[PDB]
Amino acid sequence: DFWFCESCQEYFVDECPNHGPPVFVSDTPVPVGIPDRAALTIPQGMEVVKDTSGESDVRCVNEVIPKGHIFGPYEGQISTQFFSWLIVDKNNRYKSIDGSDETKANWMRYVVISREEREQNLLAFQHSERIYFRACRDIRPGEWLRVWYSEDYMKRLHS
Ligand SMILES: [Cl-]
Ligand code: NA
Ligand code: NA
Ligand SMILES: [Zn+2]
Numbered sequence: 001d002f003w004f005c006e007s008c009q010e011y012f013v014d015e016c017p018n019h020g021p022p023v024f025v026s027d028t029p030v031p032v033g034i035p036d037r038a039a040l041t042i043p044q045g046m047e048v049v050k051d052t053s054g055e056s057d058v059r060c061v062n063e064v065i066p067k068g069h070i071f072g073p074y075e076g077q078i079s080t081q082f083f084s085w086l087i088v089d090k091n092n093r094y095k096s097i098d099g100s101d102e103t104k105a106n107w108m109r110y111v112v113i114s115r116e117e118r119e120q121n122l123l124a125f126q127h128s129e130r131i132y133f134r135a136c137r138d139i140r141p142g143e144w145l146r147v148w149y150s151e152d153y154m155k156r157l158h159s
Contacts, residue, residue, distance in 0.1 A: 001126075001127045001128055003016075003022045003127070004125070004134070004150070004152060005018070005019050005068065006067050006068045006123075006134060006135070006136055006137075007019050007067065007068060019068070022068070022070050023066075023068060023069050023070060024069075024070045024071075025043050025045075025065075025069055025070065025071050026043060027041040027042075027043060027106050027107065028040060028041050028042060028043060028044065029041075032103065032104055033103050033104070034103060035102075035103065036102060037102060037103045037104065037105070038075075038099070038102040038103075038104075038105040038106055038107055038109050038110070039056070039102070039107060039110065040107075041075075041106040041107045042058070042107040043071070043107075045060065045061060045062050045063055045065065046058060046059065046060060046061065046065075046107070046145070047059050047061045048107055048110050056110040057110070057112060057144055057145075058107065058110050058111050058112070058144065058145040059142060059143060059144050059145065060139040060140060060141055060142065060143050060145070061141055061142070062141055063141065064138050064139065064140050064141070065135050065138065065139035066135065066138055067135050067136065067137050067138050068134060068135060069134070069135045070132050070133070070134050070135075071108065071122070071132060071133045071134075071135075072106075072108060072130065072131060072132035072133060073127075073130035073131060073132055074097055074099065074106065074108045074109075074130065074131035074132070074133075075097075075099065075104065075105050075106040075108070076097050076098045076099035076100065076101065076104060076105045076106075076109070077097070077098045077100070077101065077104065078095055078096070078097055078098075079095065079096055079098065080093070080094070080095060080096075081096070082100070083098055083099035083100050083105070083109050084096045084097070084098050085097045085098075085099075085124070085131045086157055087126050087129050087130070087131065088126065088156055088157065088159060089129055090129070092159065095129070097130070097131055108131075108133060111133065111145050111146075111147050112144070112145065112146055112147070113146075113147050113148065114146040114147070114148060115148060116146070117148075119144075119146045120136065120146050120147065120148045121135060121136060121137050121139045121143065121145060121146055122134065122135060122136065122145055122146065122147035122148075123136045123147070123148060123149070123150040123153075124147055124148070124149050124150060124153055125149075125150040125152055125153045126153055126156060133147050134150070
């Protein structure tokens with residue numbers, strides 16, 4: 001697996017020759033199995049906004065999230081067969097990562113998937129059989145997170 005530099009629109013081994021290594025943002029540590037575990041894992045600088053209708057949305061708060069920042073991995077149940085992400089395993093077979101159980105998943109389950117290219121600020125991709133989201137532009141405080149599939153990820157899933 002090779003990381004993609006959003007700034008250069010090129011791939012690299014482990015360190016971009018012009019921007020350096022990938023920058024990863026850690027989830028807030030929360031023990032698995034506890035109530036509302038997923039929402040509590042939200043990194044500092046982000047907020048899970050739950051409404052009275054039971055729906056959730058996620059926003060940047062406090063400081064800009066720079067383009068290229070990586071979030072994840074997406075957590076949940078992994079199996080061969082509303083919150084399901086496909087991965088292509090080492091044996092060229094599909095596996096599904098399911099964030100349905102809020103006690104086992106992480107905050108990324110609440111990220112809204114949007115096909116509107118104007119609002120997208122995250123791109124989903126696979127690295128080492130896990131799903132990550134990378135900021136495809138700077139995300140300013142108050143901006144809602146909106147994810148779509150990276151081109152490489154869509155090309156990978158067609159196999
Ligand atoms: Cl990918
Ligand atoms: Na932030
Ligand atoms: Na959501
Ligand atoms: Zn670069």
